[PDB]
Nucleic acid binder design. Structure first.
Lengths: 48, 142, 99, 150, 109, 55, 117, 26
RNA sequence: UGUAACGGGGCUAAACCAUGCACCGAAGCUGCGGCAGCGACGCUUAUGCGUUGUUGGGUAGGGGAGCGUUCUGUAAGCCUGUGAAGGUGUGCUGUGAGGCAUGCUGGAGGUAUCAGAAGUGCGAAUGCUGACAUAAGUAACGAUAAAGCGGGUGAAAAGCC
RNA sequence: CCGGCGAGGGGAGUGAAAAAGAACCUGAAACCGUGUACGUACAAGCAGUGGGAGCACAGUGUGACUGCGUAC
């Protein structure tokens, strides 16, 4: 029980989607947004 | 254990002589291309010239079936815009009858530097006598 | 004096005192191994289904991995790329008997 | 970024890429895209999570024998030399002293010793109960710490 | 003993100097000198100064014996370019590269 | 009137196969002063073909 | 926590230019060209691990066909005659015999010519 | 003087406003 | 534009029709070795690991795992002038991002581990900045008023006197 | 010392180091050379890849001929 021995519970920390970082991440080149529409623009997306 | 490849120094091509009198041209010309390439040898390897030197004799007496003596046309283009010259089989027998065997065999050899070297081992003579007595060609009976 | 045997899905033609590389046999290094299924023993005189009593007996030399192969998969314009390495396990056996 | 909102060249016509600000983040010397601001990196801890942690650290310090309870740990003169000695006989080098009283004589005598920390039984924390090799508590102090963790 | 003389930031372009350097590569240093003397280039006047300096750098420092020297290595590098502006038509400007070079003659007995 | 593709190190040096200067290797000694000179030219000191011409 | 990326982009680029040795021109020097030279060269390497097993079987079959015909039979009747005789030698070794021990091949042809007909 | 005190950027763009002939329709 | 309406050579069967047999032929199937996902297994006695079954082309997209970089703790700890980071080779081994060892440069700093936070990874945006190529030793050398000589000086003179 | 009482350079010297010489820590890449090994002047095309001689080194380098092969 030292400072370099403490761990989180398993699954308590998921990583976080990092978009647009290559082919292997599965989130590159569109950022999970698909191709050209309103919803793939920055700030695009209709109101509620 | 790698598969054997023949070498372009240890290969020993033997000299053969062929009397092409009365023979069907492309039936003759495809056994020539088989033995110019070297496919009749167990030592065959497709990047090495492993074939033979074949002396074709009496090239003008080669035969074609049907009406091909007057109706097989040889088309070549001269690079100029008129260009498309043509000669039938019987005109080709009169002008250069050596060319009939040489054109027919050349289409059956592969295309590239190697098949252009397999063509160098085809010695085609219109007459009945070659000059290669010193190479001692065996009679190859087709 | 060579013979043909068949070990790792492949057939090999070996002579005496020759190392042949085979697929990864699970027998420990230094153990004599019999290949009772000998397809063809030849000499000045030849013997060919299987032979009846000719056994190739070898002696296991080493268990290595092969030179690494790079597997590259690529689909142009379709946003797909996949690398993978491969080292294949082998077994070297020196042939100590042709019967 | 200090600059003008003047569009650098015109939109069409010149065969350059279209730009509209010298301070765009694609450009050199202009613009961080998502630039930082000063922020609060504090986290909320529940009191029963904070007290459950300290009760679980003090339970572990008696498991790995790193809690030593004393009944008094004072030093006569406010001198680092004496406390440097107060821990050789105790056989301590990297220690956290936790007292219940307001001892300022003892407090100054460990202000220069790097591996020695003196507390007041109310400011003991997560990282201080872990990052010291021995935790030494006076008996008046372990009475108070038992109390506040109920 | 290899004896170097250099001429750095030579104001001729390296491609112009390399034409003259290939005339005296490997020649005996007496024959190399009057190749450069009857060569009608500006680089010929530049390279001959380095070769005549490598001739004296050999016989003053490392030794002596001019007559067995040879131009063993001769190579021209590209120095820093000085950037200048030529004005062109219709307000346009171009970049002139005043291209310097680095001549190195290595003489050797 | 302009290239579609940058030519290479290969083709740039292939073009300069004929840019290589030709050395003289034909200096002529003068029969009265021993000066080397261009053939059919006067010497640096102004002798030519045994005669002092220019001085 | 600003991260400069010059060290690991150099190494990532250097790793690809090292796989491009021997390539012509800018395919050995320029990263953009050498990257898709190396990606194409791995694509071909995948494909020609398939084609290698075909090209050698092509080469064996052409040599057994020649060596059978010196012994007076075609490749088809020799391979049919070996299967009716239950001889299980593959074509790699049948071609290896055909150049190295021809008298061990004329015995194989005889054992095929017999049990065929 | 081998000191190299060089110059800087010393005016902007005159015109890219250039020739315009060539159409397919009007 | 050139045979240009077998892919070609060529073919009177090397074409059609019928029959029959053999063979070739794919990344399909089988063999051999490896790896992974899913189940069924109580096979184990946290349940890993094993045993069997079957599955592993993939864009958008969803899900699950990692790698490395900078920074904080662990760290007045370990490594480090008997050579750090960096740069440049080589070798070794991981399924991969990668990791390690080391020869040479370098000449003072670097960080096992486990956690923590992100200006966290670039080939493209007619991206931005710098550097350097290419065309090319090419075009041009800016009024077609025009120059030639002899002395001079000079290291050198078509241009200076 | 060479040079034009140059520029630049070669020594000598300082210094741990001058490949710390001021256009100065480290000194990457593009790009440009020189030296060496091999290949290349009858051979057609995404320049690789699979096979592969020969040669040169101490496995490495090169790569004739050859199958497949139209970048991102």
């Amino acid at each position: 029980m030292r400072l370099n021995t403490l761990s989180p519970a398993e699954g308590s920390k998921k990583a976080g989607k990092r978009l647009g970082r290559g082919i292997g991440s599965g989130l590159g080149k569109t950022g999970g947004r698909g191709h050209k529409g309103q919803k793939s623009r920055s700030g695009g997306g209709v109101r509620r | 254990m790698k598969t054997f490849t023949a070498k372009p120094e240890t290969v020993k091509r033997d000299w053969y002589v062929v009397d092409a009198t009365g023979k069907t041209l492309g039936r003759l010309a495809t056994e020539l291309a088989r033995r110019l390439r070297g496919k009749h040898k167990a030592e065959y390897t497709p990047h090495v010239d492993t074939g033979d030197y074949i002396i074709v004799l009496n090239a003008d007496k080669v035969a074609v079936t049907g009406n091909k003596r007057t109706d097989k046309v040889y088309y070549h283009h001269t690079g100029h815009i008129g260009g498309i010259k043509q000669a039938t089989f019987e005109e080709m027998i009169a002008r250069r009858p050596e060319r009939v065997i040489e054109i027919a065999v050349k289409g059956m050899l592969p295309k590239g530097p190697l098949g252009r070297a397999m063509f160098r081992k085809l010695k085609v003579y219109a007459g009945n006598e070659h000059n290669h007595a010193a190479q001692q060609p065996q009679v190859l009976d087709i | 004096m060579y013979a043909v045997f068949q070990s790792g899905g492949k057939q090999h033609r070996v002579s005496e005192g020759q190392t042949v590389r085979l697929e990864k046999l699970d027998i420990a290094t230094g153990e004599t191994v019999e290949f009772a299924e000998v397809l063809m023993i030849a000499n000045g005189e030849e013997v060919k289904p299987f032979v009846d009593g000719g056994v190739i007996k070898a002696e296991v030399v080493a268990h290595g991995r092969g030179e690494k192969v790079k597997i590259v998969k690529f689909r142009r314009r379709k946003h797909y790329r996949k690398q993978q390495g491969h080292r294949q396990w082998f077994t070297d056996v020196k042939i100590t008997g042709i019967s | 970024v200090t600059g003008s909102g003047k569009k650098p060249w015109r939109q069409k016509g010149t065969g350059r890429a279209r730009s509209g600000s010298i301070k765009s983040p694609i450009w050199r010397s202009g613009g961080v895209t998502f630039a930082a601001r000063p922020q609060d990196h504090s986290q909320k801890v529940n009191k029963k999570m904070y007290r459950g942690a300290l009760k679980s650290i003090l339970s572990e310090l008696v498991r790995q024998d790193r809690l030593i309870v004393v009944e008094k740990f004072s030093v006569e003169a406010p001198k680092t030399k004496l406390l440097a000695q107060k821990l050789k006989d105790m056989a301590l080098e990297d220690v956290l002293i936790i007292t219940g009283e307001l001892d300022e004589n003892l407090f100054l005598a460990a202000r220069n010793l790097h591996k020695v920390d003196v507390r007041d039984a109310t400011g003991i924390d997560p990282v201080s109960l872990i990052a010291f090799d021995k935790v030494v508590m006076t008996a008046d102090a372990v009475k108070q710490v038992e109390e506040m963790l109920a | 003993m290899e004896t170097i003389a250099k001429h750095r930031h030579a104001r001729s372009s390296a491609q112009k100097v390399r034409l003259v350097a290939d005339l005296i590569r490997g020649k005996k240093v007496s024959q190399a000198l009057d190749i450069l003397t009857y060569t009608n280039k500006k680089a010929a006047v530049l390279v001959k100064k380095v070769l005549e300096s490598a001739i004296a750098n050999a016989e003053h420092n490392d030794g002596a014996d001019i007559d067995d020297l040879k131009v063993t290595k001769i190579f021209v590098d590209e120095g820093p370019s000085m950037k200048r502006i030529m004005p062109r038509a219709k307000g346009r400007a171009d970049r002139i590269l005043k291209r310097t070079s680095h001549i190195t003659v290595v003489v050797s007995d | 009137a302009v290239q579609q593709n940058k030519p290479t190190r290969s083709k740039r040096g292939m073009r300069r196969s004929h840019d290589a200067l030709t050395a003289v290797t034909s200096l002529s000694v003068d029969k009265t002063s021993g000066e080397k000179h261009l053939r059919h030219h006067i010497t640096a000191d102004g002798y030519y073909r045994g005669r002092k011409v220019i001085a | 926590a600003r991260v400069k990326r010059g060290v690991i982009a150099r190494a990532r680029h250097k790793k690809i230019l090292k796989q491009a040795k021997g390539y012509y021109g800018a395919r050995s020097r320029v990263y953009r060209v050498a990257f898709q030279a190396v990606i194409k060269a791995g694509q071909y390497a995948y494909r020609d691990r398939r084609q290698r097993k075909r090209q050698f079987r092509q080469l064996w079959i052409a040599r057994i066909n020649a060596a059978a015909r010196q012994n007076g039979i075609s490749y088809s009747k020799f391979i049919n005659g070996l299967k009716k005789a239950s001889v299980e030698i593959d074509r790699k070794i049948l071609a290896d015999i055909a150049v190295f021990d021809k008298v061990a091949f004329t015995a194989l042809v005889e054992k095929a010519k017999a049990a065929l007909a | 003087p081998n000191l190299q005190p060089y110059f800087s950027r010393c005016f902007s763009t005159p015109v890219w406003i250039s020739q315009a002939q060539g159409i397919r329709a009007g």
